[PDB]
Design a binder for these strands. Structure first.
Ligand SMILES: [Mg+2]
Ligand SMILES: [Mg+2]
Ligand SMILES: [Mg+2]
Ligand SMILES: [Mg+2]
Ligand SMILES: [Mg+2]
Ligand SMILES: [Mg+2]
Ligand SMILES: [Zn+2]
Lengths: 175, 52, 136, 258, 55, 193
RNA sequence: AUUUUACCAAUUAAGAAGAAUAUUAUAAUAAUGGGUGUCUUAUAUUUUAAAUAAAUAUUUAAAUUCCGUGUAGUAAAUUUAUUAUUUGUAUUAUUUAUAUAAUAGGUGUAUUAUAUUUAAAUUUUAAAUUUGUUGUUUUAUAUUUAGAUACAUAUUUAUAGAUUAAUAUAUUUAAAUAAUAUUUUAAAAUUUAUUGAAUAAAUAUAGUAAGAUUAUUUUAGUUGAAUUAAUAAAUAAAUAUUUAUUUUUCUUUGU
């Protein structure tokens, strides 16, 4: 049996009275305290914390005219994906933003469509070679890739796509 | 020699690690932990402590 | 304490004095600085040549099988082994000649050893058996 | 810094190291969280503050309801240095050194034994250490010092055989050590220019001795003018003469001239 | 059923008035005008002066 | 270690019990305190008690913290005209226990109403509060003092200007009804094509 | 006109020859009962007998026999011998005290849920016995200190069948020759003596009642089965330690 004695000896100053004066009583008290605190943190703390945050968000929504039920359902529908912690943070520190979220949920704005399944380009069915050129599907994939490259932030590569695709022609030395 | 490494920071704080019969790889790891931490505070990791 | 133990690193300050000594403490200059005792291999006994002098023709090197001679020196009398040389299962399979010394710290001549006696390559199991029997 | 060693304490205790204990540290007095056991995070300011302020008052801490000794007084700091010099160098060795110096001008040291040489060196070292310790309190008390102790400031140095610097001599150089490794943490009163601060302190105390002598002379002259008669006490006359001769000789020994 | 009592139960007695008025309480005294001694009002000295007149 | 002194206040003690409206504790805020008016004409007792408690305990605030006991002052008016559905004023029991043996007092809602109409509202507020705060005497007593009950319509709280709090009961619901039949309006283009 | 609320806190350096011809084995050479503050004589100062005892023994066969309680000279006077205070503190190891104490005048609270300081949220302590696994039984004031014994291993000299009841028969492959020990406290009065129910021996033994049995952070199988006294019938099952079978298949499977 490994009784946590040498570790819990240093926390006896937090206790009072006989538990702090004597050793074994304080060690038993600290052992029981740590065990019950671990049990509560594992199996019962999250329930109370999430209930508190849910009640705060529900009160913030009721001050605007809705409830936690409808707000949560419409957030899931509109696919906003905001955790209750973030909802509470917005309700407490960004009331205008939270009110705008509520107005979005209340309005008849079309929610985004489901993600489109990855399709195959029409050129993949073309005979190649038809009889030193690139595959048409591969060229279209490269064009879409360069488009996505230029779409993310501003960079010195330029907005045009043909000149950036034809970089191997530039790197090629004229024989 | 005291089998321990000490880190003295730019605010007088001192952080010591025990390296008795500890491999040099572990010694290097503890030294990098020393140079990585600032040793200016100690706060838990919770939803209320995410933002300082 | 144990390495994987919570009691191992609860002494987080005070073990060292912030102020260093003025006679023996020094700063690390850089990679070209030769630290006293620094060695990549773990040497619990860091004894070197000067502190623990070795007496042999050559310093034991990975190129040389044994630090002693391999062929009789033409300027020193060579004495063959009293009994003929046989190479057994554990012998070094190489000729070993030791430079016999005199009481005046001068090499007198060179005498060949026996690989069965001084060529049986050591083994930790047998060394540990001997040591354990002696200490018990 | 509160419990271990104060500002003018000659003691040296590492506040985080329990080197004055006959038992392993079982209970930690200053504890804020249950996680302070397996990793007390000591050395951080916000926790070592709690620990060192929960520590009890020691003999030098002078707890609140208990009386606190007068330490910042020049009239106490000077006899401290004098008693340290007497504890370092005995009277017989002091007389032998004085005779040897007045006879050979620091040239016949061969008569002294190696043990006596080492005693003199250790005494000079301890005097330098205690001067480095008392330097802040001395610079604090230089304002309201008295002439007797201002002269004892040089008397103690002469007795300890330490020539004070002026812009043997042991206060001329600093302790060797690279500035990148020397201790510089705040909260610990440690001067870094000892030959530069003690020299200006000697200049200031010379000016203060001159001011005190002039104040005594002016007070005597004003008293004589108020009495409208030249009737001086024999005690006061003898005291003035002997103090003038003493300050002259003891400042000439160190090398300072008014 | 009797058991050891914690230090808190040992300090409950000083909260009552019975403990305060018994042990820790000061006196109302003055100086005997005839003996120059501390004297409580009501109790006198053996001397002839203190018996005839009450100091 | 925290320590609560045994020498606490008592009802027989001459110092008496305090008013949380007058206290100045740390966990008691008074800046964000609004005054609401709640008319109880027709509204049922448990519903009006829940609506009042949700504003008393400060649960309607987004920054509500269980420790900090902050809330709004609700002034309930026309408690004498409160309405409960039939047979409840006679059947609903209110019981309690006293220190004497066999002292199990059991009174009807009618009896408590003819004694004092405010007692019913106070009892239901106590129940709605103890539903969530029963552990700490502070958290279960301090909210109740923020309710200002008044039997008749008159009240001295005219300076605070109580706002007429509006609240909707969770009972309102429209059961499906028959689709009404009406004549259809046609269109010339529809008749053409 | 006097005039500082109640409650709430802490073990640490140790001053001193107040630590040694010190404890326990170890000496193979002496020995007529030791009694100093002692001290006349002894019809009054006598203990002896062919056995297992202050003398103590290098093996596993066979064999009497209704649990085989078992091994013989290695040398014939040969060097396994009952040793002891100093010509090494005898040497070599091992162990060792229970006298002496200034420490803080207030961090959480003040109408009552029990340490982590933003106030809430959490609980009644452990170890054994109860197999109908409890609400049954028993123990624990605290501090310090004693307290319990199956060898996790095998390097060249080197060489290892069986089988009939027996006389016999022998055409089949290996091997790291090493033994010594095996919880603790107790559950009972008979024994062997002595002195007028006590005294001193017996780890004697109880098919054996009951309890205690010192060492965290770990890395792989079954959670109610099995149950045939006794001529030629494939096989008891669980638990645990080591250890072995890579065959097909649409995925899976602790045999
Ligand atoms: Mg969790
Ligand atoms: Mg307090
Ligand atoms: Mg002692
Ligand atoms: Mg003999
Ligand atoms: Mg023990
Ligand atoms: Mg198995
Ligand atoms: Zn009198």
């Amino acid at each position: 049996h490994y009784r946590a004695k040498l570790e819990l000896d240093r926390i006896r100053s937090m206790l009072r009275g006989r538990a702090r004066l004597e050793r074994k009583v304080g060690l038993k008290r600290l052992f029981f305290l740590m065990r019950t605190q671990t049990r509560y943190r594992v199996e019962q703390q999250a329930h109370w914390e999430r209930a508190i945050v849910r009640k705060n968000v529900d009160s913030a929504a009721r001050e605007h005219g809705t409830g936690w039920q409808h707000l949560r359902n419409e957030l899931g529908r509109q696919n906003v994906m905001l955790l209750p912690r973030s909802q509470q943070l917005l309700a407490q520190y960004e009331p205008l933003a939270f009110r705008a979220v509520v107005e979005l949920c209340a309005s008849r704005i079309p929610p985004p469509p489901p993600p489109v399944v990855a399709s195959v380009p029409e050129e993949s069915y073309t005979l190649w070679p038809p009889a030193s050129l690139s595959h048409p599907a591969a060229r279209v994939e490269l064009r879409c890739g360069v488009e996505r490259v230029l779409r993310r932030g501003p960079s010195g590569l330029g907005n045009n796509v043909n000149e950036l695709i034809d970089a191997w022609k530039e790197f090629d030395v004229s024989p | 020699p005291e089998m321990a490494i000490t880190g003295v920071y730019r605010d007088g704080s001192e952080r010591s690690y025990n390296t008795k019969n500890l491999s040099p790889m572990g010694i290097f790891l503890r030294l990098n932990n020393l140079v990585s931490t600032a040793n200016d505070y100690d706060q838990p990791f919770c939803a209320s402590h995410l933002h300082f | 304490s144990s390495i994987f133990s919570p009691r191992y690193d609860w002494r987080t300050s005070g073990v060292h004095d912030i102020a260093p000594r003025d006679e023996g403490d020094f700063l690390y200059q850089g990679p070209q600085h030769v630290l006293p005792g620094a060695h990549p291999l773990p040497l619990h006994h860091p004894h070197n040549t000067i502190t623990r002098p070795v007496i042999s023709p050559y310093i034991p090197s990975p190129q040389r099988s044994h630090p002693y001679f391999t062929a009789p020196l033409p300027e020193l009398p060579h004495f063959s082994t009293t009994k003929p040389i046989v190479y057994t299962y554990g012998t070094m399979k190489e000729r070993i000649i030791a430079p016999v010394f005199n009481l005046k710290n001068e090499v007198i001549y060179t005498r060949e050893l026996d690989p069965f006696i001084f060529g049986m390559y050591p083994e930790v199991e047998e060394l540990s058996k001997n040591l354990t029997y002696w200490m018990v | 810094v509160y419990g271990g060693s104060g500002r003018g304490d000659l003691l040296y205790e590492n506040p985080d190291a329990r080197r004055h204990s006959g038992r392993a540290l079982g209970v930690l007095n200053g504890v804020r969280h249950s996680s302070q056991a397996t990793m007390p995070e000591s050395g951080q300011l916000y926790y070592r503050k709690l620990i060192l302020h929960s520590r009890p008052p020691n003999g030098s801490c002078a707890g609140l309801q208990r009386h606190c000794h007068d330490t910042c007084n020049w009239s106490y700091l000077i006899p401290s240095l004098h008693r340290c010099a007497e504890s370092a160098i005995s009277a017989k060795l002091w007389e032998k050194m004085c005779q040897l110096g007045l006879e050979d001008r620091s040239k016949a040291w061969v008569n002294l034994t190696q043990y006596e040489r080492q005693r003199v060196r250790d005494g000079q070292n301890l005097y330098r250490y205690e001067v480095h310790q008392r330097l802040p309190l001395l610079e604090e008390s230089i304002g309201w010092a008295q002439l007797d102790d201002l002269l004892g400031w040089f008397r103690s140095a002469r007795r300890a055989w330490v020539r004070l610097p002026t812009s043997s001599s042991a206060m001329s150089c600093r302790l060797e050590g690279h500035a990148d490794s020397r201790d510089t943490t705040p909260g610990r009163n440690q001067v870094f220019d000892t030959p530069e601060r003690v020299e200006q302190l000697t200049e200031a105390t010379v000016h203060r001795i001159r001011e005190e002598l002039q104040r005594l002379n002016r007070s005597e002259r004003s008293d004589c003018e108020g009495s409208a008669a030249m009737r001086a006490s024999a005690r006061r006359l003898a005291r003035d003469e002997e103090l003038s001769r003493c300050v002259e000789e003891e400042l000439g020994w160190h090398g300072v001239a008014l | 059923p009797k058991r050891k009592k914690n230090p808190m139960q040992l300090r409950r007695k000083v909260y009552g008035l019975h403990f305060k008025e018994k042990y820790l309480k000061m006196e109302e005294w003055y100086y005997c005008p005839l003996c120059a001694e501390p004297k409580k009002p009501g109790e006198w000295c053996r001397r002839e002066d203190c018996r005839q007149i009450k100091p | 270690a925290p320590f609560k002194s045994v020498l606490r206040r008592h009802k027989h003690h001459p110092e008496g019990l305090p008013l949380y409206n007058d206290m100045s504790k740390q966990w008691l805020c008074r800046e964000g305190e609004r005054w609401w008016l709640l008319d109880a004409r027709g509204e049922q007792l448990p519903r009006v008690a829940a609506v009042a408690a949700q504003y008393i305990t400060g649960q309607h605030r987004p920054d509500f913290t269980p420790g900090m006991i902050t809330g709004d002052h609700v002034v309930i008016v026309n408690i004498k005209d409160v309405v409960m559905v039939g047979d409840q004023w006679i059947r609903v029991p209110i019981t309690w226990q006293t220190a004497y043996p066999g002292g199990k007092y059991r009174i009807r809602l009618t009896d408590m109403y003819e004694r004092d109409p405010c007692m019913l509202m106070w009892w239901f507020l106590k129940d709605e509060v103890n539903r969530h705060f029963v552990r700490k005497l502070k958290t279960r007593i301090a909210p109740l003092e923020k309710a200002w009950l008044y039997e008749d319509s008159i009240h001295p709280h005219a300076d605070k200007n109580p706002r007429p709090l509006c609240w909707t009961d969770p009972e309102v619901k429209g059961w499906k009804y028959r689709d009404p039949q009406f004549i259809r309006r046609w269109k010339p283009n529809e008749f053409m094509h």
